[PDB]
């Protein structure tokens, strides 16, 4: 007391509806008198008492002078910070946890866990912090370009589960699970089965027994490497998602990938970080996941849903459950999280929703959450509201 | 430890008097610092420990370049803030808590509820939140514009209490409540009697057995809409009240309707929300109210009180109490709520001061506060200090 | 637990040194980014746990539009408002208390009262707060201008005591004492003795018998009227100091009013609220004062200080105990107050420091500590640093 | 609850990585909205729950107008100043301790005692503050300049010692060390050995019965002064470090000083606070220590090791452990503090990166930290990012 904390069943609903809107820009015009942080790959993640919304951000803020490099991945100035969620977060508000080109964190029920990773590219560090303490490393093993999952890891009685991935942007990266305890790593995970791209993998709990995550493969295939693991065995298996419903950007018309569940396809290369989160009930189970509503660019944000079956097995179209940003607008990554009420767990999907207007400007995003809640169908759409140009 | 809270005996006093002032826009030159957000219908409610002060933001500050819009009521981007009464509701300062064009909120003894209704007009939503968690939502039910009351709902034995309504603003809108336990809706309530026109109630307290609201009638009178809800056998009836002061506005001169009680009258079209608060003692009641000092025009506010009755059935004016905004300021939406002292409760009175410049500038509001306290007569007015060229 | 508090004996100590400056000016420049709010009456007041910086805004901060009036006393739009002692009072950071164009406050080992006076001149109302609640108040009495310390007030055992007058600025205005318990006045106390004329009372414990006060007499005499109020009997008497040290500014040179202590003398018109606080040790009471380092400007701050004695009766110079302002600064009000350790009490002057460049610009203050601390002579002054040009 | 700490065993590792920046000059730009402090000598404290990011700043921000005097150490404006480590130190996020131009500040398990230097340079004054207390002071013993660490101190079962020094920059400064408990001084150290010159020095715990620091040595030598003092017995000897691998800036190549261990060598005028921390094993002690890659400049800052031996008799040369800064970014100060795990201490090294563009402009600092975490080698250096034109 503080104990452990474990997956609890979903609370009540059947639809999500939209909750909030983090939209800093709103606030960065050289007309006004605020510092919104430059930022991109925002995630959340929930404790027992409060949520923190992270983002990797370019220790640059709008307006400033620092725009030049923005739209750049990788850097020795990127930091990962958060504020509680429904703070803006500018300057001030904002806390640095560690430097970091790629991230993630998550709440055991005691305490935070923040993970960073940086270093040159062939030789990159991943760092955890327990609180306010570094505590452990893990290094790169393949000299490619070691990175994580720019969403909330998961814990359960204690053990803290998270994806790691090194390799090519444009062949093979085969990922790898860590298993941290109380900030150190525990155990090494190695899966099996369709290993040779998985990236971006966004995670949750199915089970006391299992996470499953939804991935990204940048090279090979628009469908979605889909990750079980066991986390009474500590042993994970990967195949790709059959559904005709493909989840990455760019992707091929649905269902147009011929052959079994396996088959590649065609429009494999590139892709985008996907929202992925389950909904946990007596004897059932939705799998809640959102793609971009266009086929080859980052516009719009779709949500779906389909309940049971095996998404290694299945090929039946998702359900279409409604326009969480309509094509005129932005959407980039996408993120799973949960919010723990008093009894019960809710679940929500966030949506990076970047402004970009090329290099020759700042490149920064806002957070849209939509969230399980009542019943009926899905109401209305998110905008940033920003104007670029002010 | 933590227990739930109810209604208590009110703190002794006879008089209200001058508080606070919250003008944001005091700070919002375009030679300062600072960044105010832009705002209406404010409101605040108070828990055990603390008051919150509420708003509906635009989504945007003064200075800034987004004031096209703020003087429209829904939209996109519209959220429920709060500080703790007495900060400036800034960019930094607010809490972000959901997407939302009308609003409410209470606090039940152990936690904060949340209300936030957004959607399209012809099928919004409203949305509940317990702490942090999104926990239930409620349906349209005339499919014309889903509403809530723009104040503090009322909780007792932790059961909350909150008006909503459905229907025209020129025409029929019937309202209903809800009772709310942890954030879920247990119970509807269905009122009987007078039930045409019924909005943006402000409600509290007469006693532990019942709930009164002085509410708005956009369509048809100009006298108020009065609702006893009997909290417990949850029933609910509606009476316009019968005094000569007529408190909407517009409105015609007192005591000009003709008729029994229920009569309608003259310049009954618009309208505009009402200060009402409860001073409960042992064998008496005290009504607190207030309205516009211009019977057309939102300029102005007075304070008036009646001790005990039937506000469905006396036709007897009430008793003038004092200028709390002179007919030279603005004078717009009002609201009561109550502060929790150690061992009794003290009754305020809130009043939205509107800096309307127009469409062609920036829309927003003061806060200003009266409360019981001490005895004699209302001393001191209240002005917002406010410059809409700089 | 928490339980009432007492003043305690004094922490060793034999001498004054530089603590602390609060200028929030040195940040309001045009060519900077800051909002630190336009204040005078500025002071100090401690509970168990922390200290709080209290002062009376303009509602209105540096840079901005609203200068105008800043050089003014009384108006609709002052409040008294506080940070904790070491954060700078701007926008954000300090919270709005009440509206106030004079103020007192001090914490009683449970919780804070808070003291503003406002209204019409002729007319004024002290409001009293607890915590959050507004629980009473108290009316003009000569219905010339109520007001009350500008410094902390003084708890033992729950009963706070509280100086008050009322009267013409020129002419006979006799003070009162407040006993608030718990946010009620419970009694009124009327002093015997030299009463003609007592304000700005700075207030503090001699022992747990007995509060002492050096106050201003605006009118007659540049001797301080000296407060002896017995907290067992809540009985209050009033003499002159008798020191060759006059206190007050303006005063003529020390020593020169003839006669007995009572003599009122020469210089007598105006006057400035003065410095005093109690160091209190076994069988030893010392008593520090401050005063302007000019005779008849309000420049410079000397601190001063007397072991034993009867105030009343002693025409000794008070021993000159170092320069806290130089007199090519500005030294304006002063105030006592006392910090809490774990086992003894703190004795500390403040000092405001105003930035007055007459009434065609802003208007507001710097705040400058010393406190007892070790043994030895006070080594070093105190400068705003502020140019008021930028 | 709470109790007292103790240094204990350090946490597995055996490479140090980048961990943090804080660079609040990103955010200073004439474009942007931001108020980042003009602060020099930073340095870091640990407690058992959070960690406080300290400076001295010139009571001034950027942008400002109070640029002229921040290259400057000693005037009436310096403050020491501390934000929760990971915040931005700006106006608003910063806590004004008190008056100071040198510093030190440590957590005893209980409380935070924090130590401020200021008066007249021939007589100047240590002040201690106990929480929010004023506590003790210090006196200048060789009226040439008093000074303290602008470093951490350090406790074991609540006696906190700390480091005092006084004499001239270019000749004799024999330092002493305090023994101070919940805030009071309740013993003098005065070192024995090599004592002619021994200021800024950089202390930690070797075991519960040593403490260890590294010092500079202003005026005869580029050796760093070593320090030993040992806790159970209240005694301290002083010796040079003996590896050719001196430490200080500026100094002549390594190994090239002549003669046994307590020769002075060539280039001694000058010099730099440097890094400094200890790695405790079971049957093992690392000594982790900073100095800059130019050996003239204040341009880069390298890391090195060594494990065990005497460093006042061993020549041995330190391992080069990485570039922490390159030579073409700034390297001032560095220092040495811990972080407390749940059952063991993490050391690290901060770094002071000023920004340098002369006195005809402002003048400030960023803050580097590298911690021990994981194995191998470290792998990244930090740049500011900040460009002092705009
Ligand atoms: C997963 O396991 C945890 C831990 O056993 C379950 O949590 C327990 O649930 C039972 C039944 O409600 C409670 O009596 C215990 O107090 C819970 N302990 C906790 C949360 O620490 C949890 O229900 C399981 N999750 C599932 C089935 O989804
Ligand atoms: C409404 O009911 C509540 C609950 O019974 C009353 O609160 C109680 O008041 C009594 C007498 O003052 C106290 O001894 C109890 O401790 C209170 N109980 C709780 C749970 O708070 C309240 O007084 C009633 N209010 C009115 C206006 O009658
Ligand atoms: C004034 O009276 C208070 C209350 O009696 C004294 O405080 C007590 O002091 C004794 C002796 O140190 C302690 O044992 C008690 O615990 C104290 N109780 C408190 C503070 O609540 C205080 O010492 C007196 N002040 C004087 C003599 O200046
Ligand atoms: C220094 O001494 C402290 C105090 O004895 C040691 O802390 C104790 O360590 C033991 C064994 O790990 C624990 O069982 C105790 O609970 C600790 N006591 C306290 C009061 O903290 C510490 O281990 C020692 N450090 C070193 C480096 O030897
Ligand atoms: C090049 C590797 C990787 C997959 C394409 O690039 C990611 C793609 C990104 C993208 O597609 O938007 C942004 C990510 N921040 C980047 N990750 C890192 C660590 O740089
Ligand atoms: C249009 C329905 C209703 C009655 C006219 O309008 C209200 C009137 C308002 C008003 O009269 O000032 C402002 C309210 N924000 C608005 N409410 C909503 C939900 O839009
Ligand atoms: C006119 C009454 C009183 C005594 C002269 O004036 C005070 C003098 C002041 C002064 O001498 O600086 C400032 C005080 N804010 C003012 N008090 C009020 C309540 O207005
Ligand atoms: C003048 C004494 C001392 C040694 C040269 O100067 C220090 C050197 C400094 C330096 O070498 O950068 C900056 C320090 N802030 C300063 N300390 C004080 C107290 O002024
Ligand atoms: C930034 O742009 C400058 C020109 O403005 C160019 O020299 C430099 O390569 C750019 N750097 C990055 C990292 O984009
Ligand atoms: C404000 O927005 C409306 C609707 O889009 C548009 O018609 C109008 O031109 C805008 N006003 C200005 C000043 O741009
Ligand atoms: C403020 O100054 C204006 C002119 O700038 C003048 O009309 C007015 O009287 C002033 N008011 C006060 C309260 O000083
Ligand atoms: C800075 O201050 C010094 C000392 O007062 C003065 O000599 C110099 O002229 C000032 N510099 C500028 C640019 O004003
Ligand atoms: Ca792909
Ligand atoms: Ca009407
Ligand atoms: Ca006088
Ligand atoms: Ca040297």
């Given at each position: 007391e503080p104990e452990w904390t474990y997956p609890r069943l979903s609370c009540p609903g059947s639809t999500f509806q939209k909750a909030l809107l983090i939209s800093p820009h709103r606030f960065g015009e050289t007309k006004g008198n605020s510092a919104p942080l430059i930022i991109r790959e925002p995630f959340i993640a929930c404790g027992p008492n409060e949520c923190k919304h992270f983002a990797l951000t370019?220790?640059?803020?709008?307006?400033?002078?620092?725009?030049?490099?923005?739209?750049?991945?990788?850097?020795?100035?990127r930091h990962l910070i958060s504020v509680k969620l429904g703070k803006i977060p500018t300057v001030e508000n904002s806390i640095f946890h560690m430097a970091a080109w790629s991230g993630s964190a998550c709440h055991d029920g005691k305490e935070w866990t923040y993970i960073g990773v940086d270093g040159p590219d062939n030789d990159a560090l991943l760092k955890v912090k327990y609180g306010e303490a570094y505590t452990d490393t893990y290094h790169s093993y393949a000299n490619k370009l070691l990175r994580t999952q720019e969403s909330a890891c998961n814990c359960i009685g204690g053990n803290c589960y998270l994806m790691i991935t090194d390799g090519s942007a444009s062949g093979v990266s085969e990922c790898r699970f860590l298993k941290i305890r109380e900030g150190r790593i525990i155990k090494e995970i190695f899966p099996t089965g369709r290993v040779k791209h998985t990236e971006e993998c966004t995670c949750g709990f199915a089970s006391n027994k299992t996470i499953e995550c939804a991935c990204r493969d940048n090279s090979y295939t628009a469908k979605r490497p889909f990750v079980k693991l066991n986390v009474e065995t500590d042993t994970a298996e990967i195949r790709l998602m059959c559904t005709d419903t493909y989840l990455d950007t760019p992707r091929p018309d649905d269902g147009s990938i011929t052959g079994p569940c396996e088959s590649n396809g065609d429009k494999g290369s590139g892709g985008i970080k996907g929202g992925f989160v389950h909904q946990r009930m007596e004897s059932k189970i939705g799998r809640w996941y959102s793609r971009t509503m266009s086929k080859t660019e980052r516009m719009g944000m779709g949500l779906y849903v389909k309940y049971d079956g095996d998404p290694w097995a299945d090929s039946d179209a998702l359900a279409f459950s409604g326009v969480?940003?309509?094509?005129?607008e932005p959407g980039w990554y996408s993120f799973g999280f949960e919010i723990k009420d008093k009894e019960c767990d809710v679940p929500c999907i966030g949506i990076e929703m970047v402004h970009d207007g090329g290099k020759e400007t700042w490149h920064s995003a806002a957070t849209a959450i939509y969230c399980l809640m009542g019943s009926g169908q899905l109401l209305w759409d998110t905008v940033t509201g920003v104007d670029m140009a002010l």
């Open positions: 370019h220790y640059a803020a709008q307006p400033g002078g620092y725009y030049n490099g923005t739209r750049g991945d990788r850097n020795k100035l969480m940003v309509s094509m005129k």
